[PDB]
Ligand binder design. Sequence first.
Ligand SMILES: NC(=O)c1ccc[n+]([C@@H]2O[C@H](COP(=O)([O-])OP(=O)(O)OC[C@H]3O[C@@H](n4cnc5c(N)ncnc54)[C@H](O)[C@@H]3O)[C@@H](O)[C@H]2O)c1
Ligand SMILES: NC(=O)c1ccc[n+]([C@@H]2O[C@H](COP(=O)([O-])OP(=O)(O)OC[C@H]3O[C@@H](n4cnc5c(N)ncnc54)[C@H](O)[C@@H]3O)[C@@H](O)[C@H]2O)c1
Ligand SMILES: CC(=O)N[C@@H]1[C@@H](O)[C@@H](O)[C@@H](CO)O[C@@H]1O
Ligand SMILES: CC(=O)N[C@@H]1[C@@H](O)[C@@H](O)[C@@H](CO)O[C@@H]1O
Lengths: 438, 436
Amino acid sequence: VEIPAGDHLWKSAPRPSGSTYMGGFKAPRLGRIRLAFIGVGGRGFSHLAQMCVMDGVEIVGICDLKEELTKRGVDRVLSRMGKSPLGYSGGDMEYLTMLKELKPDAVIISTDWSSHARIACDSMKHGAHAFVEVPLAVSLEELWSLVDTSEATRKHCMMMENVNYGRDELMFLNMVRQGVIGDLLHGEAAYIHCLVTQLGDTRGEGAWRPEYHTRINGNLYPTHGLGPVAQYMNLERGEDRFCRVAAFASPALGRNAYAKKHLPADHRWNNTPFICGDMNTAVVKTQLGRTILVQLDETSPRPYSRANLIQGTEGTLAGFPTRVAGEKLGNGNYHEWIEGREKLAAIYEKYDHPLWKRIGELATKMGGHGGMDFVMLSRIVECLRNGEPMDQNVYEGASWSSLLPLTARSIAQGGMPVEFPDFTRGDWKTTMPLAVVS
Amino acid sequence: IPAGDHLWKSAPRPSGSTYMGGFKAPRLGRIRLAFIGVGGRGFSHLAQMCVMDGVEIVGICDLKEELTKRGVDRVLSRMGKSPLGYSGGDMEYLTMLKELKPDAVIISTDWSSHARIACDSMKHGAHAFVEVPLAVSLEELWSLVDTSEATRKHCMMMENVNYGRDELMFLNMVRQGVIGDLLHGEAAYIHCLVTQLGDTRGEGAWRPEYHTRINGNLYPTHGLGPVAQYMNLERGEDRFCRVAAFASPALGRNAYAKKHLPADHRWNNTPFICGDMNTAVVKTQLGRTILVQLDETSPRPYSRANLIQGTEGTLAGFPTRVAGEKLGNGNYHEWIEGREKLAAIYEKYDHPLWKRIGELATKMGGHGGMDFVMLSRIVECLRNGEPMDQNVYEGASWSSLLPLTARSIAQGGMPVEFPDFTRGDWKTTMPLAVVS
Ligand SMILES: NC(=O)c1ccc[n+]([C@@H]2O[C@H](COP(=O)([O-])OP(=O)(O)OC[C@H]3O[C@@H](n4cnc5c(N)ncnc54)[C@H](O)[C@@H]3O)[C@@H](O)[C@H]2O)c1
Ligand SMILES: NC(=O)c1ccc[n+]([C@@H]2O[C@H](COP(=O)([O-])OP(=O)(O)OC[C@H]3O[C@@H](n4cnc5c(N)ncnc54)[C@H](O)[C@@H]3O)[C@@H](O)[C@H]2O)c1
Ligand SMILES: CC(=O)N[C@@H]1[C@@H](O)[C@@H](O)[C@@H](CO)O[C@@H]1O
Ligand SMILES: CC(=O)N[C@@H]1[C@@H](O)[C@@H](O)[C@@H](CO)O[C@@H]1O
């Protein structure tokens, strides 16, 4: 598994005259999206399963290294839609044959992190919009190649950050847009999720994800908690942008201890040291001076959390557990949290995002992390069919994912703040913020 | 108020001075105690000290004559003997020190005078117990260390949060290895104090002015104290190494002044520069991280975070919650929280100090009882000639977050190094044990 490390992870040209800034880009309408999947493991098959019941979608091709996973996807589509997609398996470049033969309008890429950028760039160069699982890529050069390829091909490239479509995340966006918590000051983002048992897995994510902990000390998974907070703050879209980040890491102990406790002495995780600090902590500074706490711990034994805290001069909203407080909320007693299902009912009633009210009920029926997956996929289909911009542009996906190489650089440089590259080349200033859709 | 480089700018220990780690003072069967500063906090300490055995409150000093009289009257009504009262000027406490020569003083003045009053008290032969933070600048903190080492008198910052029930229980659990090897801690002081801008009598008289002069963690000790002692920082095992600091925009207090105060008011003509939310990350020598945050402006619930995380579990406060392989059924995917589920955790891990005094401390009160536990330990240590649970170097290290975060912010967030107030002697300093 190719993993850029050291300077190649975070090392570095103006936009070509024939390239287009892709902020707010509207693609031609697709009344029936001819969609292909590249990588149908756990995540890829989940997207496939939900999209075979969506209107205006035709799944034309399915590609995976494993023949039986391709067949599982093909059989699922045939059962639900009455038409079989073409299946491709074998080598890691077999997806190129699918792109050439099917010429899909769009592809959903749910492979491991190492191949996200290459597969998405090839897809766009073959005339397909690229929807890519998190993180968008691993290195700064990979992120720039996705930006530059999108601008050169004028094809959508969107990282599929599903957390922005959670009910609480959508409600907080709605409350922030309405000015409920005043002027924004500070946000807190996290991915706290104990994944240490992946060390005992030889298939699925265990096959590739733990190895990243042996090569990179930094925030390997920064997007889930950050995505919502970045769009609360309108980062990269007119109002503000990521400016700098300083990163810090606790000792790297949990995974070394897990391997010694549960795995044989000759196992590779007992002979390859884990160097990624169990808890990664970073502080982002935006251009307007806001701070974002960003934390990653996918090792320690503790409850799941994404933090999802957004704080302003007139109140604070936070998740895990969902809680709100502010002068305009409830009885206005900001000294205590409004939390729990009973007290929050009036908050949901007043501030539920209209997108959640339109799709969230069916999304809770469909499922996928509580419904956010179905909302996210529905918005992708709606924007493609209506010729409307995506709720997340390529520069946002690149900026959120750049926390991985930038935190690693800061940690390698003793915790010094490092500058964010401007993937928009200054055009962030004229990029319209995400509105409250519908 | 020192600003700029004077806040964080800063000589060998004299051969005749003593390192004060684990220092044991002579026993005081009778403690002659004096109070300097009897506003809200000073009078709270005075009222609780009236029920202590082996304590004689001999003097009370405040700028305001009516506050001195309130303290004197309270001691007479509760203890049956009147202390001498001193008021009128900011150097009148020296007259009390000279006339009474107390064994110890409790200093509850505003931040600006903590270091000077405590230094003078020690030089006049009294142990110095100082409210938070211990001082403001690095030079002031060094002067407290050097004076304590030269006079061989106790200097202790009265960090009461370390004596909360949950904070004492977490200490007990950490000492027993319940959460494995320590990795990370989270400390905070989140408390909306913005209405001090409209108050002229209490802390409003002096505290908001600091927000116009310093951009940094003005109040770093409450959340940090417990986490530092979980990690045995400055006492053998580990030490504060470096810290990088960051601050949100400074908006809340400016907005409050324009909304509630006249245009010619000093808070409408002096800009507030301290970021509403201050965020800093400490690295220890063993490589642990400590998140330290301050927001005494924004409208949100009170919190000190009190999170300590190890390879086998995590303990956290606000709300109190624990999770780990050794805790409950070992299902760390969900918090053990709430009064019902935490009952078994308290039963198994209540700190013996809380079990001995907590029932009386709850009756007494003072931030839930932690104040009475802290004062009881101070008296016990003075009476028995025991070391204080918090030495002068810990108080200096925790308080140094103020000038060090301000310095880091002034340098664009670069990490800045902690001074070693122990001059290397932290390595041979015994960690705080689970005291009975
Ligand atoms: N947004 C979410 O909530 C969420 C949930 C799970 C996973 N993910 C992300 O989705 C991605 C995949 O996750 P996963 O759990 O399904 O891992 P997985 O190992 O189960 O699936 C990866 C699949 O991609 C295939 N693959 C790899 N390279 C290929 C190539 N060149 N051509 C064709 N197929 C290829 C593999 O055969 C494999 O089956 C990861 O980036 C992960 O971080 C996101
Ligand atoms: N640990 C806690 O929980 C806690 C609670 C409240 C206050 N505090 C701290 O205690 C200190 C005082 O807080 P406060 O609320 O009582 O403020 P306050 O303004 O009400 O009390 C300060 C008193 O000190 C007096 N004073 C100032 N300079 C003096 C001098 N040279 N000589 C004699 N008296 C002098 C003032 O007259 C005033 O009465 C502060 O450091 C504060 O941060 C701590
Ligand atoms: C929303 C969310 O947390 N998604 C994550 C996903 O990104 C991946 O890490 C997975 C691994 O099993 O666990 C979760 O589902
Ligand atoms: C333990 C604790 O939080 N103490 C603080 C104290 O330090 C001071 O800031 C006061 C201001 O009114 O509010 C609280 O009591």
